[PDB]
Structure formats: C-alpha cells, structure tokens
Amino acid sequence: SEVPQVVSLDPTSIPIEYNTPIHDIKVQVYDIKGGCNVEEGLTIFLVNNPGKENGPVKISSKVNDKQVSEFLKDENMEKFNVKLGTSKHFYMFNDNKNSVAVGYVGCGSVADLSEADMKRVVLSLVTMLHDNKLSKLTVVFEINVDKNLFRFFLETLFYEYMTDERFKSEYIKHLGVYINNADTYKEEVEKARVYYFGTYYASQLIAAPSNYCNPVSLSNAAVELAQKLNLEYKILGVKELEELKMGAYLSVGKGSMYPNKFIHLTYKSKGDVKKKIALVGKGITFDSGGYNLKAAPGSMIDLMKFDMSGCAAVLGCAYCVGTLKPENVEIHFLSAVCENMVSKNSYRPGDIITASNGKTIEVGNTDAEGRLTLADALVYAEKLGVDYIVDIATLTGAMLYSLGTSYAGVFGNNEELINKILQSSKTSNEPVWWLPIINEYRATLNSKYADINQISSSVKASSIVASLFLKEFVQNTAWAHIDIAGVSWNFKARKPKGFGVRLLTEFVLN
C-alpha cells in the first residue's frame, strides 16, 4: 500500500476526479412533435441531406419562436452545407429580445451514421461548446438514431466535453434534446452518464503518467474504487504471488522499484448466480521494453504509460457494473499489475521462467512482457471456476497494420463467446473485429529447451502468435482475447479513448 519514492517530490497517489461537471448537467428529452422552443443558450440542429453529397442545409422542425424561425428559413440555411462535421452558429435576439445562439452540425449524406461518423458530429458540437460560455445546449435530432446510437451520442458528448486538468497548475448546466419518439430514449440518459464515467475514469488512469500511476498507486486506486462501490477486493503482494508460483508475471516485474500487485475485485449479484465471468486486463504501468529497449524508430516509448489500458478498461467496467448492479452474475475483475524496466535486477532475453501452471517459458524478447503477465492471470482466472474468461490488452503493435486505430481485434477458443463479444461491440458502438487463431503457426512456439517459446522467430503475424501463446494458459474454459493496442490511444486528440469499458459492460449486462 505505501508507494516507494526516489525523491520526496515523487507522487504517492494517482489524482482522481469522481465528481465531474458532467454530473451536474440536467438533461431533458422532448419530442419534436409540438415544436422546439428556443429561449436561451445554444440550439444546434443535427441535419443531413440524403443522396445530395455536400447538399444544402434544410431544417424541417417547427420552431416556436418567430425570429429564430425566420433565421432558419430554407433560403438562409441553403447557404450552408451538410458535409460531415461542418458547422455554423449565429448569435441573435429571439422573440423575447433574449440572446440565443442557433446553428447546425452537418451529418453528411447517409441515412445511418456509423460510430465514427457520430464521433465526428459530436467533435464538431464540442468545439462549439468549448468556444462559447453557455448555461445551456439544446440539440435537435433531424437524423435517425436507434436507442444505442443515441446513448452513444450522449456518452461521447460527455466524454469529449470533459477536460482533464489534474496535471495543470464553466460548463453548461442544462442539456435539452428534441427527438422523435422521445419517450423511448429517456432511459438511455442515466445509462449514458454511467457509461461516460466508467470511460472517463479509465481514461484518467491511462492518461496518468507512470510516475503517478505505478503498480502500487494503481492497485491502491482499485481498492478505493471497490470501497466506494462496495465490491469485495483483494490485492495480492509478492509473497502471495511467490506462493502461487506466478513466475512469468513476477519475472516481468523484477527490474522495477515498484513491487508487483495483483488486483482482484469481485461483483456479486444478490440473487442466484447463474453466470461467472473473469475479466482480465493487461496492467503494465510503464513498458520500457526492458533489455529489449524500445529504441527503434516508431516504437513510441513516450506512449508506454498507456500499457495498463486493459487494466483501466476492466476497472472502468467495475464502476459501471457496481453502479448498475446486474442480476444473476458474479464478475471477477483481475489485473496482474507491474512495470517493465531496465535494471541490474531485470529479467533477460533468453531467460527460462516457470508459469503458475508449471509450464516453462523461454523468453525471446523482454518487450513481449504482456503475454507473460496475462499467462499467470489466465491461470489464476481459470482456477476461479468461471463460465467465461475475457482478457483485454494493448498486446501487439501489429494491430496497427491489420485493423488499424479504429477497430480492436478479438481472438478466442469459443465461437459462442466470440459472438457475444461481437454483439456487445454492436450495442456499445466500440468496434471490434474477429481474427483467427491459426493453429498452423503453433509449431513456431516449440522451444528447443523450454516447454514453450514466448515469441516466434519467423512468423510476423504476431497478434495471432500472441493469441496462440495465451491459449496455452486456458485449459477448459471459454475464453476470448481483445487486443486494443491499436485503438486505445487517440493519436490525433493526444488522449486515451478509455476503449473497452462500454464493450465489457454491455457484455456483462446483456
């Protein structure tokens, strides 16, 4: 629990913001039928033009203000176009001589917006929010969104609007929404607020640098979260880890000044437990690569505080699950947390180490540390006797060359479990794609001396090879593995996505 310091100025906890301005926003959803009132703040119409690419803006909603109605006449609005993410907004006096701002965000030409399209719409809305002092935003939907996409709009809106100022040395108070069939959308609001925080909380852990967020401070943070949500909790220290023979996980942490800490939180429904689930996140608080130092061009060592993104997603999931309280399930939230460093004490390339299931592993590359920690976490997970194990991890840079920065990859040993993940991707709107575990490549992990190799020498499909490795540590339980190495960090916006929180929560809930 006590965070070691090198100098007295070294931080001993991760700063965490729980009560955010987003939580003070009162949201009201009205049906478009009856007309829209425009009384104050900013009012933005979400507008498309099907077929007509870069077509003119045309507002179809009745507005119950004569000055604003005149502004929104076809002749005026056609001066503007609906190209995706394009916006205009104008200040004017309404019927009461009150200052109001009115504008639109273009939603392009397709009737159904993808999650990527919707993020661009939101980003354009958020730019307006960041540039105007407003007590209120009103958004009018003249496009089609289903319940999940509506909730996604709110989650993204909240997440993108919120600004993380923890390391630096006026938000709207009201949100109105006009949408057709408003009554069906109302229940999405408070769910969105919960999903927003899980995601934002995960983002806070990820964005926190490795001096602040280390294995001791991160496990401490998880205990605090568990205490607030009344989850059972257990942090495993080195002595216990040694007793459990977690040789793969411990070896990765040998070169760190921070002792390894294994996080185990448990949610348990009040009723009968019908499904048991273990969620496992990769928890490397900084990945230097170890003796295989990240020194090659493009290795992005300055990003590597993000290598606990999987742990963050899992803890973000525990927030949502602990808040929403699903029935009939028992959820274990697990992460083998450590730091991968260079030291007289570090493990070396070539070292042979022994995992908790007795398998000996030849280390081919100390920068393939994630799969070693996951190996012992997977053995620990299966001993819990669960129905499903799902891990999520920034595991392989190869993901950038396969699916890229938008879609995460999912691998697994059970087709039914994979389809549940894919369905959860659909309803969470966090995109995932099923990639194969190709058994033909398994032979490349046949070590000359140890039971198995950590990495392949010859096969470049490393996301698949890593999955083959992980599979060796799940013996008879449905397991899926989500590789978020490509999708976790938003490179353009210079911040985490908190990717996976909503995916995992939808998986648990539905």
Add this chain to the structure above:
Amino acid sequence: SEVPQVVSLDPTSIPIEYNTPIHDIKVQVYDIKGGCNVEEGLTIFLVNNPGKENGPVKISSKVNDKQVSEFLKDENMEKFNVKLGTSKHFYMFNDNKNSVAVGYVGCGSVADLSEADMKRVVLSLVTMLHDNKLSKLTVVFEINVDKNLFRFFLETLFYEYMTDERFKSTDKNVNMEYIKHLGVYINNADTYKEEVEKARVYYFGTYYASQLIAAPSNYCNPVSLSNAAVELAQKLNLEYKILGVKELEELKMGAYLSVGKGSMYPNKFIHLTYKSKGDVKKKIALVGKGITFDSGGYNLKAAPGSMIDLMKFDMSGCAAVLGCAYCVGTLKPENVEIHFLSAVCENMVSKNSYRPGDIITASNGKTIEVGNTDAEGRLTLADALVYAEKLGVDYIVDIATLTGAMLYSLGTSYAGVFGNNEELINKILQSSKTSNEPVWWLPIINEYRATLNSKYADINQISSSVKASSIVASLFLKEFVQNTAWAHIDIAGVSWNFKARKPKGFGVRLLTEFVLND
C-alpha cells in the same frame, strides 16, 4: 507479341510445361471392401488411432495375401505409432513369392484431419516417393475424408510431387523417375472416382500458375506473359483479346499506363472469355494484379525486409486468374460467362518512369495523386476494375499480392478478402472451404477514407496517417467500382511458400470453386 530484347541472349518466351509427368500417371480407384492386392511398387496405409495421442498402428482393411496379412498383424504393428507425419517402410515376400514394399503414414489421433494436417500427411508421403525409383504407388485410406478432402489429397500430392526443372541445365537430378501408376483403396470408392480428374485439372491450373510465378522477370515480362495467355486461350478455345498501348490510350487508362512508363516492355491488358453454351445466368469478371517485376519505382525497394528479389511474384494474381481460366475452360461449367482480366505491366526505374507526386487520370475520370510509386498495384487495378464494370457483370472479384502488411494480419496461411457485398463475400468464404484454400474476411473501415483525401487531386493513392495498408488499399480500390458486387482477395502473404522456396499457385482452386458452385 514480339518481346523486346536488350541483348540477343534475353529470353523471348516463358517456358511452359503442359504435359507433366503427373499427367502420365494412370490412376485407379478400388473399393476397400474387396480387400487390397499387394503386388508391386510401394503400398502405403494412411492410418490413425482416434483418441490415443500416439496410439499404435492398427491395420484394419483386408489384405488379399496371406503373407502380407501376417506381416501387418497387430502384434507386429504395435511398435509403430500414428503420430502425424510419421512414416515407416516394410519389406517382405507375398504369396506369389515376389518381394513387395509396404508401409504407412501416421495421420494422428484427431478424427477429422485439417487442410494443413492433410498437407503434412502428403508431404510425408512425397518423401517416400522422392529417393526411390518406383513404378507404382498404392495408397489405402484407413481414415475418413469427404469428397473435397480426397480431391485435396490428390491435388496436393500431384503438386508437391512435381518438380520444376525448366531453368535447370547443368544441375540435373538424374535420379528422377516418376511413378506411372497410382492405386487407391477407399470406402465407397464410387463417389470418389469423379474427384480424380477434377483433382488432376485443379493440380495443373495451380501448377501452371506456379510456373508463371516462379518464371523470373526476364522470362516473364508483360509481353511474354500476355503471349502465354494467348496460347492458353487458343488451347482452351477461349475468346481472347490483348489490348496494347494505343488501345489503352484510347480507353484513357492513365493510372495503369503511368505505372508501366519506366519499363522497356509495353503494357499488355489480358482479356480472355469463357462463355457457356446455354442460357447465361451469371456474368463474372475475375481480375488479377499483373506486375511482372515490382522494383518499387522511384520509391525503390531498398529498405531492409522489402524483399526485392521476390518481386517476380507480383503477378501472382494474374497467374491465379489464368490458372482458373485453365480449369474453367477444361471443366466447361454451364450457365456462366467468365471474363479473365489482367492489366499487365512492369514497375521500373527510368528516365521515363512516373514520379512520386505525379497526378494521373484513371479511365473513370478520377485524378489520383501518386504518393508512393511502390503502391503501383492498386493503380493498375483501378483501371482494370473500371474496365471490368463496363462489361456489365454481376460480380467482380480481384486477386492480388497487394500489401506486405498481410504478413502482420493473417500471415502466410490465410489470405484476406475485402468487399462491398456481403453475399459475394459469403460465396468466396464458401469457395474457400470447398477449395481448401483458407481465406479470412477483413473489414473495409470507412473511417480511414478521409485519409485518402487529396489537396489537389480527386484522391490520394496512399494514406497520410493510417498504417493498416491492406484496408486503405481496399478503400482505394472501392472508389473504382460504382454499382457492382465486388470483392478483393489480398494474397501478398500467402502466395510464396517461403519454407519450400516456391510459389503456391494460391487462388486457382478458390476462384474455380467460386465459378463452379455458382
């Protein structure tokens, strides 16, 4: 048709072997219930032991010979196990008092062999053929295989057995003799018999593609390759047309023409057509990337790992498409019209080459800013796709060694398929299953499209920011298909067998099964 030469020693045609030793093999299929005769050559039992990991060898089938039956008694076989790939040879005298060779190949303990597993069986089998002058092989199936798997066994046997000596002169292998007879014993032989000549056809289509791929770029250039295609079309009685530069200029194929600018070989666009005799119910265009050498152009393949010495293989897609034309032209399916297309050229460094930054105009009027001259495949394919869609077809399928990134996504065993049409994609996946050429569906992620935006041209050739080049290339290609079901098979990772140092001829069986099942 005349192949330009720099010196008189430059080859002016690709050597093709049409009648291979495999074609001289007389294949006979017998039902296993009648028992096996062991008379001469080498008789091999394919055995498994379901359950027991490396369980003993048990010879179940009847053997119409007292002497040999005594030999293969469980007592004598107990010492041998069925571990995948294991083989043993036996020597004995039959009731005739003649000496016979017998043996087995282990097929493991799993009761349903995989495509990769069966290949390991065949490879073990080929090892037994390779340094033994035999007149006849007999194979007895004591394992279960469906019709497709049986065909796959034969195809793979034929392909691996065959050795390409077109470019050997001094280095003989003078100990080479092919069996003249193959006997097969299998349960319900009557259903399997039809698979024999189908397998032989598939073998050659695949092996033909292999010959074009392995043929180096001085032998296989755009003129010689299009010449070979003409000769194939003539042998198969297919209609054919080869478009030359003047015609390609008239068609305004500026993306394709630009790639070939730096080559001493004029661009040649291959167009073969197979048409069924009856009602035509489906029209299909098969498009193959046909870069006969890919130097990279001014974006020269000089970086570590760029494998410039492999780049004669960059017309693998074209080879696949021509191999498919062999099978389709031989099998003659009904109700169908197939167009076999390749925009053939060579990507070279010259005073005449196109340059990074050049803006060029495709045949559909779209201007393209060339960001990297080594992304040349998608440019040639753009113009080929436009041409294909003008034929007014139901399906366009292209196949290409398009992106090295495939090695990082699916690797060397599975090709990737991308597309704009789920039904077409499903048909290709079904064709993958029945051809036993593995393919995996990968997504066209529209979010990356904005990164192909050009400040000056209509579209950029490559992405500024996205590293998922297999997807970006797919997004680029999709811009050249307006309203037709289309799929794209990226075979960059699977085309070359790096371990065996030879091409696979990947895609011939996949495309043929697609054509046939439709």
Add this chain to the structure above:
Amino acid sequence: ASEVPQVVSLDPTSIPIEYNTPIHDIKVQVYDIKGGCNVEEGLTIFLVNNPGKENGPVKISSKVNDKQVSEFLKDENMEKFNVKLGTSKHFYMFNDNKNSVAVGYVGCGSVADLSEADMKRVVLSLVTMLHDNKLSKLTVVFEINVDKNLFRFFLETLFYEYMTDERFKSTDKNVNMEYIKHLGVYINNADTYKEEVEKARVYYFGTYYASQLIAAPSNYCNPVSLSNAAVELAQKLNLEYKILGVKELEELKMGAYLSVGKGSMYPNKFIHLTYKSKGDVKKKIALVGKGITFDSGGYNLKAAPGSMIDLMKFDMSGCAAVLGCAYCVGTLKPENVEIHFLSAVCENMVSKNSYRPGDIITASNGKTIEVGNTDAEGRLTLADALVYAEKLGVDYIVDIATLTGAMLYSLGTSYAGVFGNNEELINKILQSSKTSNEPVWWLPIINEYRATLNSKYADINQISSSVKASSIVASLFLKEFVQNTAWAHIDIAGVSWNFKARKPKGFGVRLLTEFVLND
C-alpha cells in the same frame, strides 16, 4: 578504338593518362658508402636507426667527404636528436668550399628489419621533406640494413608518393609544384643494388598507371574509354590485343557478364591483351581483373549507410592492376612465358534495360544462375571471364578483384586475401607477396557453405541466403567456373583505396608482376 558515347557534348571521350611523369626525368646515381659521401647541392638525408634503443640518439656512421659537414654531424652534435620512427630534422651549414648545404635525417626506429609498413612511414616522412621545398636534387644515405627487394620497395614507394596527380585540376594546380632532377643513393655493396633501380622505376609506373585509371571518375573511365586505353597501352608496348564487343560476346554466350551491363549506356567491352616471350613457351598464365567502371549496385542500389556509392569508380581496380602488370611485363620482357591479360569490362547501372533481382541468366559454360542481388555483379562478370580464360589452355588462372566489402571486416585495409583450388599456386602468390612487399593473406574456401548456393530453379545461386562470410561464398561461386586448371583469386576490396590519403594504391601490380617474373 571504339567511339565513346556521350549524353552531352561536354562528356569526356577518353581517360587522360600521364605517361612521361616527372619521376621519369629523375637521374638516379648509386654510390657505395665505403667511398664516403659527398655533400653538395640539394638535400642530403641520412636514414638512421638505433637497434634496441627505443627513441635512441642519432649517430651518423658513414664517412662524409667534407670537414665542415663531418664536424657538424659528429656524435656530440647529433645526440640531442633521436631516431623515433618517422621523425626528421633539417640541418643547414657551409661546406669545405664555402657553399651552403642542406642536410638532415629520417629516423628509422629501433627495430633492425623494417616491415613494409615501417618503410612506408619512413618514405612518407622523406616525402614531407621534398614537398614545399624547391630542390634540384635529393641524396639518401642508407645507414640501415635492407635486402634487395626492400631497397626496390623504398624507391617504388618514394616515386609513387612523391608523384602528384593533377590531371583533373584546372584552376587549382599547385603553383609551386617542382620536382628534383637528380636522386643520389649511398648504400653498402652498391653494385648489388643497382639492378633494382630501373626495376623500381618500371614497377612505380605500372602501379601509378593503375592508380590513374582507378582515380579517373566513371564519366572519364567507362567501358569504352577503359578498353580504348588498354588498346593504346598494347600498341605502345607491342602486345597483341583483342577487344570483344557485344556481338562477339553474344556469340560466345557470355550471358552472366552481358546481363550485368544491360543497364548501361556503354556497351560491354572485353579486354584481351597477350604477351608472348620470343623463346620457347614454358608457362602460360591468364590474369583476370574485375572491370566494373562504376558499381551503383543496380536495382539493389547502394543506398544503405556505409555502402560508399561515391567510391565506386574504384570497382575496376582489378582490371587496373592487370593492365599495370601488362605494362611491367611488356617493358621488362620476361622469357619462356605467355601471359594473357583479361578483363570483362562493364558498368552496373539502373535503367529500364537493367537485369533484375530474381532474373535467371546463362553463363558461357551453360550453368544457369539465379540473381539474388544485382550488387553481387562482380562475380557474374568474373564467371564468364574465368570460362574464357580456361579455354585459352593455360597453366594458371589468377583473378584480382574488389569483390567483397566483407574484406574490411576480415583483413582490413592493409592485407589482401587470396583463395584458390590449388596449394602450389597459392604459395607462389604468397611468395610473390613477400618479394613485392604487397601483403596478402591466405583465406579458406569453406566447402560446407557450398550447399547455401543451391537454387530451387537455376543450376546455382549467385549469393548465399544464410552465410554472411561473403568473401568465402563469392570464392565458392567463382570456383564453379574453373573446371580443371589451377586457379587463385585475390580480393582487394579492402586494400585498393587509401582512405587516409584519399587516393588509390594501384595495389596488385607489383604482386602480379613478381608472380610472372619469379616463374
């Protein structure tokens, strides 16, 4: 001759060659030390050591035929100076005839037998005294022991290093460039050393001639201009000559050599010079040099850091040494031998017409070759040159080539490597290395690596897939093209260019000549 093609009219159409050098105007007189030294005009340098006494004091042992100078050079006066290898001092005084004379010494250290490397340091120090001093004469007094070969080596190196190549200077010629007209040498047993003097002058020019061809840039020295210079040389020496052009190379089916030159604007030219003794021929020898006038790498372009593409005009160093040897042999006229001087000359360029990585080409002996890297072009040209050589029906084939950059990692910049298929011939090369003072080291042809040249499609691979010992692999490749003749291969990739001095060495001329002469 052939016409050199030009892209523009300002493209040079011949290599500038200086035949009558200032070194050739130098009159050399050798005296026996026992007669005493006359000390008059110019600069008189004593070569002095002190055996065992590291940095020991200078002592002038020779009789000096002048009272003033003898007094000046007496032990007490000289003890303030020391013999540290390479150090030197200038003296000024008036002699017995009241004329001012310049005197000095170069220190030759404390080890009695000077290595070839030590002697070069002594010579360089001496040359430093000749530069920037307008002298009419230099006199050198040997107070160190040198055998006949080492004495000749001194003279050769002096001549070579003193000479300054200004062929490509225009606005920057040295205004003060002025050479001695006389060289005096005092040495014990002078009559035994006299025969080495003109031999040294001939060896110097062969080496300097090779140097001129190598230093000449690839626009000046291309396959047409280089073969033209070989013709001119042959005419001046009365050697027989034949230059094979493309049509003749095609007829001989030299596909490996032709493929390399496909991408060049300059047609391939195969040089074949022949010296025949007037006597009865007892030995026949072919000397083959790699003649790549520029090596860009071809499609395997030299773009990697350290590939030194700007040095690649030097890739005809082997051809240059063979031609330099032709000069020496044609001048000294050895008896009872017939020597063939051979080079498959071409240029390795990037073009629409270039051969490609992966191409399969057929050598003149029928062997098909899979090209794995267009930058391993030397061994391809040498393949056909070796087949051509063996058909001449000679007793020995020796090739010399800047073949593998790996040499720098094995033997470095001072020692060349020799490989071969015949021990007797290798020892004769090593023996010639001793007498020429151009150091060579015997390296193995490791047959275990041969399998790594097995091609899946062609008869043989040009390069290894797995073996990094490229100097050895290259030698294995070359051996496949000599069937039944004693053959040796000298890789001078590391030693040809003097990186410190920024000039070629003309390495191999003296080595090869000694080889021809000793036989």
